[PDB]
Structures are given as structure tokens and as C-alpha cells.
């Protein structure tokens, strides 16, 4: 699809078997959600946001389905006001910003 | 133009007689810039992100030029570590996401 930006660009994806509404965020290097149930171990990651740097959990090789594509990707879990999918995943689905 | 997202989409904008490099950010509701002195009255606003709330000044009808288009736009000014243009300005220049 070609999405205009008058509204927030929210899509529904599947992650670790659960449907989650996520904001498509070109200004985010990474994909981060608050308090989703993902199995297995993780490693600490420090990410920078507008308010400073925040520690999150990093989960690798997570199966996700986005706009019809089934991929595995890195997913961060931590105290974000918005669940976002960032360029790491947007690149996996071939997304572009056009103007 | 069509921009893939493997790189951060950084464009220059002219504003307040200066040239600034800004991230084209579909995740930001509104443009926010750190180091800039804009003239006239403004209203205080809080914006929410990773790392909590950030206090900004909202300036309205600011002349800017971006991607070759001159418009007036809302600009938030406050201590972001990364300057971004948000959906308010991306819509003024007809930017879309495509996947
Ligand atoms: C939905 C969110 C997170 C909104 N922000 C936009 C995001 O694009 C934000 C842009 C940014 C990049 C680098 C450092 C600082 C900020 N990236 C971000 O946090 O990336 C993290 C999360 C995962 O990857 C890394 S915002 O900056 O809080 C914001 C909020 C309101 C306005 N009007 C403008 C900006």
C-alpha cells in the first residue's frame, strides 16, 4: 500500500503469535514494544529516545508477520509510550519513504 | 523521489536563516528542532517519547524550505538529541510510506 501521513501510520502485525498495533516509525532505528510476552533469553540494550537513553530487553530472531511478509527480526521490549516498528523491520519489508 | 530505509532519511531544511539536517520521521507528530532561535510568541507544550516527556516551545507559521518547497509550518523547539521533521511537515510536502 501507499499510506499518506495525515493520520498516524499504524498497522497490525503478528509478533510471537500475538497481533499488535504498531506505529511505522522512520525516525526509529529499532522496533520496541511495552510488555509483550516473548519466550527465551534476551540481552540488555541501551536505546536513545527524545528524553534520554533507556535500557530495554533485546530479543533476536523473533518471527513476525508484517503486511504479508513472514520474517525474523530483532524486537526490543521496554517502557516506550508507543509500540513502534523501526527501520530494522521496515527495511525487511522493502518500505520506502516517497515524496 | 523514493528513499529506502536501510539509511536514516536525513534531509536539509532551511529555517530561520540556517540550514539544518533533519530526520524525516513518520513516528513524530510534529517537527522538533534543538538549536534554533525563532522570533515571536510561542506556546509551551509537552511531547512524549522514549525517556519520558520533553518540554518544548511551539511556534506557529514558521517559514521553512524542504525538498525544494517553501511552506509555513508548526515547529517545536526543545532539547531533542536529534532534529526531526514530523508528520505535520511531511504531509505539507506530500510524503508517503510505501510497502
Ligand atoms: C512514537 C515515538 C517514539 C516518537 N518520537 C519519534 C521517534 O521517531 C524517535 C526520534 C528520535 C531519534 C533519536 C533520538 C531521539 C528521537 N525515535 C526513537 O525514539 O527511536 C528509538 C525507539 C526505537 O528505536 C530507537 S519522539 O522523538 O519521541 C517525538 C515525539 C513527538 C514529536 N512531536 C516529535 C518527536
Curated annotation (Swiss-Prot), chains A, B:
Leader sequence range is: none
Locate the Peptidase A2 domain: which residues? 20-89
> Per its UniProt entry, which superkingdom is the organism in?
Viruses
Region labeled Dimerization of protease — which residues?
1-5, 49-55, 88-99
Q: Which residues form the active site?
A: 25 (for protease activity)
Q: How does it assemble?
A: Homodimer, whose active site consists of two apposed aspartic acid residues.
Protein name listed in UniProt: Protease
Q: Which organism is it from?
A: Human immunodeficiency virus type 1 group M subtype B (isolate BRU/LAI)
First and last residue shown, out of the full length, are 501 to 599 of 1447
Amino acid at each position: 500500500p501507499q499510506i499518506t501521513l495525515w493520520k498516524r501510520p499504524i498497522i497490525t502485525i503478528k509478533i510471537g503469535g500475538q497481533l499488535k498495533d504498531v506505529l511505522m516509525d522512520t525516525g526509529a532505528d529499532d522496533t520496541v514494544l511495552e510488555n509483550i510476552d516473548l519466550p527465551g533469553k534476551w540481552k540488555p540494550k541501551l536505546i536513545g529516545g527524545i528524553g534520554g537513553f533507556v535500557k530495554v530487553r533485546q530479543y533476536d530472531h523473533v518471527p513476525v508477520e508484517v503486511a504479508g511478509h513472514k520474517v525474523t527480526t530483532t524486537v526490543l521490549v521496554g517502557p516506550t509510550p508507543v509500540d513502534v516498528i523501526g527501520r530494522n523491520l521496515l527495511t525487511q519489508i522493502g518500505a520506502t519513504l516517497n515524496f
